[PDB]
Design a protein around this ligand. Sequence first.
Ligand SMILES: C[C@@H]1NC(=O)N[C@@H]1CCCCCC(=O)O
Ligand SMILES: C[C@@H]1NC(=O)N[C@@H]1CCCCCC(=O)O
Ligand SMILES: [Ba+2]
Ligand SMILES: [Ba+2]
Ligand SMILES: [Ba+2]
Ligand SMILES: [Ba+2]
Lengths: 596, 596
Amino acid sequence: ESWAQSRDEQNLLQQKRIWESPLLLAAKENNVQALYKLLKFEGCEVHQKGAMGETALHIAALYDNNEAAQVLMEAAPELVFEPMTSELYEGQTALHIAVINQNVNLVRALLARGASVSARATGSVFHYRPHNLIYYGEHPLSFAACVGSEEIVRLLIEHGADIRAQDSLGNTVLHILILQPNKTFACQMYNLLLSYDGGDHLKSLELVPNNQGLTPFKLAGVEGNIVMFQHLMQKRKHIQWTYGPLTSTLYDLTEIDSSGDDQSLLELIVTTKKREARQILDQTPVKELVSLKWKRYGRPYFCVLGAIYVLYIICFTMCCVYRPLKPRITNRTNPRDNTLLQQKLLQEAYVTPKDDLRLVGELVSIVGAVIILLVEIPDIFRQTILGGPFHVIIVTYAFMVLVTMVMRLTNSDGEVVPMSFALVLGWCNVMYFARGFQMIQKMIFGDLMRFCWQMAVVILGFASAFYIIFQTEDPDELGHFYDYPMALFSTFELFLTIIDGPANYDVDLPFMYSITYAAFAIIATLLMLNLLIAMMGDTHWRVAHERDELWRAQVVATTVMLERKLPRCLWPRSGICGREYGLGDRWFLRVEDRQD
Amino acid sequence: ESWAQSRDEQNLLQQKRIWESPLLLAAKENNVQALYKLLKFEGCEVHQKGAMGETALHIAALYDNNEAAQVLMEAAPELVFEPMTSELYEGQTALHIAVINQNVNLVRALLARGASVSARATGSVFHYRPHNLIYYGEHPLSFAACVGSEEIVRLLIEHGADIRAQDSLGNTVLHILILQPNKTFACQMYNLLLSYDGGDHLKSLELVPNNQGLTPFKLAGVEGNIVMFQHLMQKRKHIQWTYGPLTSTLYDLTEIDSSGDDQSLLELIVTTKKREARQILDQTPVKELVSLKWKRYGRPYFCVLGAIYVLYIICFTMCCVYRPLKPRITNRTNPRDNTLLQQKLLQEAYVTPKDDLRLVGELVSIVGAVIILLVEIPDIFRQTILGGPFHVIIVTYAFMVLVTMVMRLTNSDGEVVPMSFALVLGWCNVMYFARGFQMIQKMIFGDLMRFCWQMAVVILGFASAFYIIFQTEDPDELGHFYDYPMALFSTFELFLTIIDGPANYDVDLPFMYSITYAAFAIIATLLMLNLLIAMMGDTHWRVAHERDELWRAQVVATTVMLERKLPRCLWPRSGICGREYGLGDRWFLRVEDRQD
Ligand SMILES: C[C@@H]1NC(=O)N[C@@H]1CCCCCC(=O)O
Ligand SMILES: C[C@@H]1NC(=O)N[C@@H]1CCCCCC(=O)O
Ligand SMILES: [Ba+2]
Ligand SMILES: [Ba+2]
Ligand SMILES: [Ba+2]
Ligand SMILES: [Ba+2]
């Protein structure tokens, strides 16, 4: 079907041609007597391309068959240069197979015959695909670095192996070592390849970026390689002094910061779907960074912008609790008796008695919605959620306010449908602002205050909704929300299922109650389910760290969020510059640590 | 009472005859001087059958009494051939006891006297019953293989021990070794018995099947023997090549596949009540098999057949939401006022105004029900549940549709009783189709979507039911379900106990509400209980694997389910054939693995 089933067939088709071709069969079985009987007399095709376009030397290189390979090179030395003419292995030579098998004597003999150390194995098997179990690159030097054979690495360098070489994906030999499972052993091989660098400050091998704009140091962070990241950190930190147990080390903090403006480590961790990369922001050069960004500047501006959004939403409800005003006027209350509508769509906006208080309030709800769009719509052009789906809700909230404006100036009967949606999307987006937090126990009390915030926020978005839903309808029948102080008290009682369903079907309710109350039943249970997991997940195991860690990543994702749109006069740059004094120009972070 | 209490008495009755018989007493106590005083002068019964029909040599063989046994064989060599004449040990000879005790010098002396190596111990103690603590077989070669004494095994083979021998249950010496507790040590003894095989490709000892049609390789899977299964897998896998860390091994995949058509490993694991056998489908030759069967062919046809069943059930409700139509007609609403029935049984089927849309819809519900019976009724003749009780519900669903047809064409008043049952059995059988799934966390979100699917499926089966239950009755009193958009909204509110019981007892409700709402109260709580265990069982321990594993077996049981009835043109055979190319005819699976 796909090809996974194809190659399965080609590998079987390979063994079929090996079984058939006696030259390829003797190269596999290492039949030395059968190779001289075959090459010297009885005249054969020594350039015999097998199933996978392989030579007899390729088969003798796949199964360590040194005695059989040396026969194929002394009788026909042209077989060394021949690559795999197939599509699965296009570009692979006999040297690539000898390097991965760590055959030192075969590599020593292949280089003695003059093997190309720059042959790119562009075959489909060597691609960086999930259906390929290993990704080693294309050049034979990169294969030697990935197998951990330091002898073959230097033996290739001695024959002119360019460490500056990049594969099809723009990865140097340093990038490929970071994508290897054996993290603790790849650090040893990483230092061997750096020793053969040009020794010049310009055109450094560690600075050659990926095709996706990623230096090797920057790649270890996006990939969550803890061992390589700590190892690469040794090369970019300077110990200032040692005062006994203290070690006031100075970290580089260059490629771990903004402007690239896409090009930072922090942005790449909070926006990637790789869970494993989360752990990088906990390392000793990075954990001190985001902690200072959140203590000052971060936490205050979060609450300053939080209180601004709290007032911006309570003003929207202030214009809705005293919504616009009509008696039914129409005699349609006699036909279709089920209906209870006392619709208000009294357009006649300009009664000036007190309204002008509402009017300037309605003007605030408009100028704030476009401002929300003026900071989020130009941002979608340049999307992940660990922040919380705040961005998704804050744009749909300003969408409902503008529709209510278009709902207005046309005198539409369905005023209530778009206006009620902006009430929940405005409040329940506030509970996002609960992240304003700096032990098995005070963790129970800490997550409980999360619920009291999220609960009080939800009921203030549905009680104002349920009020509008039944402020127009008749309060004699189904009057759970006849005024505001009892609409909040009935919805609060609703939140704990102590009161029965505000339904009453002798009389037909509006199309919005059968929709708004349905969502109030799911959120009121998920918040009551998210509270039990807080209460129990705190104590049953050290999961609480697992519960803990992400909120911390949620705050880190929010901390990067608050630094993108805020101007330069507020929120100064982290670290200290190095231009006068002395080390400029990169901004460094002074960190001291104690040891026990 | 039973016999367990019997033999308890015979073992005590044995020691009673041993205590009494001085010949049997001296054979037990190894009294050499008392045996010559007893056999040479003072003339005794040397063929003295004890309580369990044992000879004096049998007692001297039960307690390692070599000095006492050699006396009983030099003075009466006929005691060797004598078996136990009792019923508990019928067939056991003095060699069987010497082999299990691993008495090498007694076995060497019993074979020197000419002991039968083919004597079958058919006694009731040697049976494969749960009340027997060991099952070693019948032949003395099988006893030597089970005790792990490789010296006695070969010593018996040297005297003509037939390894091809089978006991009463058709088990060779290989089958019995797999049913042993010491799995890691039985692998050593398994290779010893295979070495003495005929060496011919035909009539192989590993191919001799059980009496229940089970080769030794096939038996290790049904019994969950992980150690033996991996060991027996070495003999049916071929390594194609080694490309460094990769090892592209080719597995046999013969006796692990269909047609036998009862005779496969997969069918035997998903249908057995043995929990332990579940672990076999996780081994490295098998885990790659069912994974490819589910990615392609498996998952799409599951959802293709799933969407077909979703439309087949929503069409059934489409014919019920607009059910057939009568005003009460009858003046019986004045007597028995409690009743609210506005019964509709207006037979007069052929009003053609729109009905013909319903009529062809009712025709679909019939032709689909018999098709369900045409694929499940011929299957019950040839029953386990890890799939899920889908099969049990899908036949009872088509049973209710046919009863509604018989309910029709007779004008029965109880139309509603069989028709309402098909609504829940049709939807709640859909939630089975939730198995369409490809970490502590995304596991919480993964099991939560299980609930949202199962919840939305249940309410769509009871809201349509509660509608029919009260579509006939008066909606002024107890009108929770007067139309469809409010029958769904009231049942959804019912699902979370926010609304009060749609009961109203001033007025008598139909016999079906007091039954349908009772089942809606149990399922709505079990699904809310199955959600809490998902939420907490994910995180408190690695149980989530335990939670995880079975769903995986549920999918494997479903994957075998979808391959039985589907034709041959769809769903091609797994693996690659071996006829041209080369290895034919068995279908092999190409598997490569990386090592770190
Ligand atoms: C074994 C095959 N026979 C051969 O001559 N080259 C192949 C080497 C296999 C390497 C597969 C590495 C990968 O998965 O991409
Ligand atoms: C001890 C008994 N005395 C004897 O002469 N044979 C018996 C041997 C007991 C073996 C019981 C094995 C079983 O449980 O089946
Ligand atoms: Ba009335
Ligand atoms: Ba309750
Ligand atoms: Ba109640
Ligand atoms: Ba009355």
